[PDB]
Design a protein around this ligand. Structure first.
Ligand code: NA
Ligand code: NA
Ligand code: NA
Ligand code: NA
Ligand code: NA
Ligand code: NA
Ligand code: NA
Ligand code: NA
Ligand code: NA
Ligand code: NA
Ligand code: NA
Ligand code: NA
Lengths: 489, 489, 489, 489
């Protein structure tokens, strides 16, 4: 299935077409049934009077069929709470995701009526619903999707960006949805390298025993018992004399069994999704670099499978991290933070990054802090905390803040015989998701001298059985000021 | 044990004395061993040279004995993270709480060297360690405690307030520590009424069958299976023509067995502490009204015991709340929010309050959102959120924010046959502590037209086996601008 | 069913008879098939040659049928380990308990060939298998049982005692087997009072609110939520000028639901058996007093039902015990030790007992210390420990020692606000069964100045669905030197 | 850190010194502040009057600071219960273990005032607190420790022994504290062989496939799925014509995952400590052989890692042990007893040992039998049981007895298709720790014809996060009569 975003309603190809019209209630109320819109909608909506009659009847929000199988109107609510995004983009996903198209549909045409601040999140929300990945052996259909945005301020360049963003989102989700017997560590390295090639990036791959020799103790010891070897992948977009030097570090655990402290029967399904941070960072980097990204930018992907064998990490093991610090592993199901500790230290010490983001599906505890729609962000920089919250609202990739208090909470990871433990298995003073973040931060002085932000996306990275493709939209809006894209400025 | 706070070092009575000196490292470094301080300290510290030598040796923070049994120096750290209070008052508690005084000690003299912004939190932290409640049948000692604050800006009026604050804190903790076979609903009503009498308040007490008749369905049906009857207590401090009308609503569950959905063997000890919100609000109200509180203020205490009998609430029961809305009870261990729903509705509709705080020990989930030191605050008013966080830092009663999003999260409480359920027993989109708060808020339109703040203090209300007395310090600093107290302005 | 023990083989009444022959292998090898034995056995065993042939063939131990339905030989092993009784009496129970008698059997004749040191335990083991209690509404048969002991040293007076012992054993078991809807606290008081009347004892009964007024806080507060009231029953056998003053304190929890810390679905069946200590002490007292007991002896029965209501003990409650000491109840399923604390204090302070035994079915932990056949004894007196172990071997009511170390283990029950907790819900330094015993002992200074022995019989009090009647045999052999019975001297 | 024990107070080197004075209250009361003691203590204690004043004030027991950071007095209680050791040596550990020394301390000087029967346990208790093992990457300090014993009867030869005992204890603990990714089976073989070399022992190492070929089915099949191979190590100290032939068999499970019946998330941390028996036996053997051990003595170390792979033991597997008997493995987490069964059989049949001790960290059930301070000893020899209990009191390595009853309890291990099962997964008649011991004993006829003692030290081998170094002190005092050491005679 191909997805193209266009600036303005246009005709779609020949072939059975499904029409979905999307807009906030107040916007739809001001739409005139005339011109190109009439031409597209008249197949399903009789005339202007019947249009206005229907718009009057329909509630503040919802989904309404315009045909027995080929058409729908999605009404997005106007009102929103302060903790939500005023775009209400999740409402689009909620109403659209259940929609199926008849077997013989060739095209899906979306007519999106949106004010400029809503367009990006609305387009992303639609894109998320075209799930690339399936291994069904019948019924597979490829569709031609046109998302036609009706917005005065929108430019043709904005539409190119939105098409690229739609791809980045669908690619993140595809990588997440792919089972780990297919997306092995080797396969995810290959996916990253493909983006590396396409972006003209400087590519570094440190694999298997090379990780051990170079001192990546976290990445190596976590992944050493995988069926394919651990890897650290760096894609670098180096801009001589740039004022910023930004690293996007992603957790790429292609599967987590929990290790020797094994996950339960019901807790181990879905653990293919534990590479969602890596996938999100990779595809964010791709979307930004496609659009004239003016600063130095690195994607740093820590790629392992955490599995079970006589050579695996055992609780009690002490390893030496890239930082030179030692970690007592008391929890093999808390391994993601170990590989990220090496990734973030590399970003600081080797790449000389001064803004370091790490994004990961870490803890089930994250949903108890920020719920299922908001990523949980912990940062040493208050201004960056506010900026990423703002970016979450603008993108629809929602972000809520975590307490930053290493002085109060890092004691939860005290060890008698190593510099720290990787986890606390009992009662702790910090929120567990914060404590997980602090393990990572302990290896770069909790961000001292620079800006460090840790982002836990365990729950918002998925809805039901499907990856959401969280990450590209957030970082596009957060870092979009460094691109050529009008709507991101 | 009596606790007096004084403005300046003074002599203490005759009798064996234990000396504890407290200060931040940078403050202690500038203390001259001379004058009244020398007079007090020279019992234990030889001269000025030995003083300075010791201060040089001792680390950034800690506790150091000045005698084999009668004396200690507590060093408070200067540095603090952004998520912590810059007072670092919890460090005082941590170092002081373990200290025991010899059996024959008559006096405990504290010399507190503190800058003005630190004084209140530091004094509170010391007060917390003088636990009133004990039923030991030997070894009980009453001590005369003098907390002598050395601070230039401190006034004599400030010291009166700080003595009253110390009492409010120790009283909150006493009520929390008292077992529920002693502090029954009747006993807690009596305690509230005593404060009501002393404050010259207008006192309302609605009890037992009177609650049912008046339509308090939450308070009544939760508490109807207690060994003593449920009660709603209002203390009102009415100031004609005041611009603010503030209600402090407190959860006063004197014991929670969990109800018919009974708590576990290990989960039911400590449930005497489920009235910590009521105790904290009562003692905050007392401290404020003692100091010329210039606005209309109400304490609203919802006082029940949640126990097990054939007449208790059962999951599936539907009751009608004071609001007129119906609630399907699917969780009898989520009963605190029911009584608070009536309390907050009463505050809005009967008391005409325009600022409504509710404070409660609600969920174990709160610790997973904000950790064990920070209360979790959910409010419809962003400015109030910032103000209470600031008050948390100033008071040492730390506060962290919860997401406010009824649109995203209230759906977690959907019911097919009542207006809402009281809880969600599976997977929900909101943080569980937020969802608990939203149950309460649903009965006043989530604060619409006014300011509503819900504060979950489950974990910060206690450390180990002892109540902390959380609440009075927070509200003193938050609402202290309406008092006559110089340090609160 | 009636059970008579006779000194020598005699004829039994007319009516269908079942014959069971019992002996150690070495004893049976020396039995001549002649005389009264021939007369009894020749119904089933052809002649002396066929007897000797069979005895040659049969292994070291087991059960062998002598008829298709009416007759068996039980061979008891000669060898035994040092931790077992050399009587090997449990082997008799093991082989005999499964035996059923045809519906129309009128008599059961046992010929027991036993050396003098084996007789008591062997007779008790046989008696245990005649279970008094049944509420089956068909098939109930009353049998005439004659246990004919063949032992040179046995006297006619010994046979009277053994008949009384058989009754005491069967009575203990009957009381244990009776469901608690029948054997209520009132019913068990009545049973105790009946023994009191028959023994010519001085009877004291303190019940219901009288317990509270007299300060029995343990007995009262544990039992106050029962459907029938708590009671303390004392039967006293006072011998002016006796050198010993002995109290037998028994735990008579007629049913334990666990209280508010309720027992599990699978853990609550069998809790009618939690009065086995009371039943055992009552029936031991009866057997001793029937035979000219020369010392002052008291049975002290603490009789409660531990159930669930709004007035029940809650974890966190603090109560004042008869001793005047306070106990913080953190575990309502650890209630038996509370009532025993009052019983033992009463025995010391009111009865002036100088030897105090308490016997109780306390913890499931007891089986992890001493297994399922041995009671676990904790005592301040080493000589008494050895003596009761010796008595266990002689009686077949096996006893193993527990560590006695209040200095090392009593800290497991530390409380911040009462003199002690009743239990420790986590990790403790002592064996849990020892710690349970120490709760009781803490109220009499752990036996200081006297002899105190605590005996936990949780597992040996029952096999499968039936009470064993543990207790009477142990105390008969332990204290039998004070009776007129030749075999007990 | 080096530890030297000296006979008498002497000067310590130049460098910042920490002073700790240790004694029972009654001993300290008779200490004169004069001479060498005055010289050492005067830095911290003013004069003799101030000394005596302090000793008067201080309670029966405790720890009292003599300086703000450099000095402490530890008072040991005089009184002890019969189940405790009258040395009260655990009180020293309890008070001393929390003590930290300033970063720049060079020396720690201990002045131990102890009567002769207390010296060994007191010295050991101090030694235990100098934990060798740490992988912290900052803050590591090596100290010079002098334990100066003040005891009239003490000889210079006794002080050499006590220095060697301190080393044996600290070495046991070091081996225990070392994570299993470092102390592999190969590493522990190497450690054993080093002791072998130093002691001039005859050394046998049977490794990997050699174990299978030689018929060590227990050792081989348990360890075959380790990342490094299983091993059996024998160190032999052969004394021609000795009357005793003693084997010390130790369980050296370098890590236990539980095997295919895997341990839980919270139950698997600490399982590096499952080689505590091997470490204790090795270091006991070292201390004895260093001091002219006059009998034939063997250390037999069974060294495996129990891990998870397709070739691991599975429940249901039947293996053939060194004894020739078959064992049905129904519990892969009960593997330690399998390797010990081969060790003890080897000791009997190959080494011709007539006194066989096995020591192991076996079951969590051990703490429910004997608590956390006492090893649980099960032996066929009553005299040896009494002797080891006595040795436990004399050494401070406490020992409590387990029931010995193979006739009553071995039936818990009945199998239909092998000679026995290795465990019982349900209800059993024996204490589980006894039943575990009986598995081992079943392979040498439960000790028939010789003396066999099984010692379960699961809990006393550790306190908190640290190995105690249990074993060397016990066996020094038990077998010390065969050495040249005056204090052991
Ligand atoms: Na199809
Ligand atoms: Na994980
Ligand atoms: Na993971
Ligand atoms: Na006292
Ligand atoms: Na509750
Ligand atoms: Na509650
Ligand atoms: Na019948
Ligand atoms: Na119980
Ligand atoms: Na009980
Ligand atoms: Na350092
Ligand atoms: Na094991
Ligand atoms: Na093991």
């Amino acid at each position: 299935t191909q997805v193209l975003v266009r600036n303005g309603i246009q005709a779609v190809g020949d072939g059975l077409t499904s029409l979905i019209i999307v807009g906030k209630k107040s916007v739809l109320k001001n739409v005139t049934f005339e011109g190109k819109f009439k031409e597209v909608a008249q197949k399903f909506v009789t005339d202007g009077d019947s249009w206005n009659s229907m718009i009057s009847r329909i509630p503040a929000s919802g989904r309404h069929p315009l045909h027995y199988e080929l058409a729908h109107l999605i009404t997005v609510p106007d009102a929103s709470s302060r903790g939500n995004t005023p775009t209400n983009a999740h409402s689009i996903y909620k109403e659209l995701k259940p929609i199926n198209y008849p077997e013989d549909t060739k095209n899906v045409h979306f007519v999106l009526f949106a004010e400029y601040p809503d367009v990006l999140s609305h387009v992303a929300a639609i894109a998320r619903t075209f799930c690339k990945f399936s291994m069904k052996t019948s019924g597979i259909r490829e569709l031609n999707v046109n998302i036609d945005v009706v917005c005065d301020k929108l430019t043709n360049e904005d539409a190119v960006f939105l098409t690229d963003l739609s791809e980045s989102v669908r690619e993140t989700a595809r990588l997440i949805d792919t089972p780990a017997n297919i997306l092995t560590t080797d396969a995810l390295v290959d996916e990253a390298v493909k983006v590396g090639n396409a972006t003209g990036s400087k590519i570094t791959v440190i694999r298997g025993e090379e990780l051990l020799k170079a001192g990546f103790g976290g990445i190596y010891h976590v992944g050493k018992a995988g069926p394919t070897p651990p890897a650290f992948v760096v894609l670098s977009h180096e801009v001589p004399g740039s004022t910023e030097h930004i690293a996007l570090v992603g957790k790429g655990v292609v599967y987590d069994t929990g290790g020797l402290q094994i996950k339960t029967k019901t807790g181990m399904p879905n653990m293919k999704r534990d590479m969602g941070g890596a996938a999100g960072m990779l595809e964010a980097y791709s979307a930004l670099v496609k659009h004239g990204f003016s600063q130095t930018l690195h994607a740093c992907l820590c790629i392992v499978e955490n599995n079970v064998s006589p050579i695996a990490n055992k609780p009690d093991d002490i390893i030496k991290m890239l930082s030179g610090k030692t970690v007592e592993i008391n929890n093999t199901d808390a391994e993601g933070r170990l590989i990220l500790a090496d990734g973030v230290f590399y970003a600081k010490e080797t790449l000389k990054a001064t803004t370091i983001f790490d994004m990961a599906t870490l803890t089930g505890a994250q949903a108890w802090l920020s719920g299922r729609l908001h990523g949980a962000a912990m940062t040493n920089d208050e201004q960056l905390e506010n900026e990423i919250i703002k970016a979450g609202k603008a993108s629809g990739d929602l972000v809520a803040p975590m307490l930053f208090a290493p002085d109060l909470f890092f004691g939860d990871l005290k060890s008698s015989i190593a510099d720290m433990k990787n986890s606390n298995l009992g009662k702790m003073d910090g929120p567990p998701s914060a404590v997980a973040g602090l393990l990572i931060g302990a290896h770069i002085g909790f961000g001292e001298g620079l800006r460090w932000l840790h982002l836990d996306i365990a729950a918002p990275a998925e809805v039901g059985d499907r990856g959401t493709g969280y990450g590209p939209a957030l970082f596009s809006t957060l870092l979009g000021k460094y691109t050529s894209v009008p709507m991101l400025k």
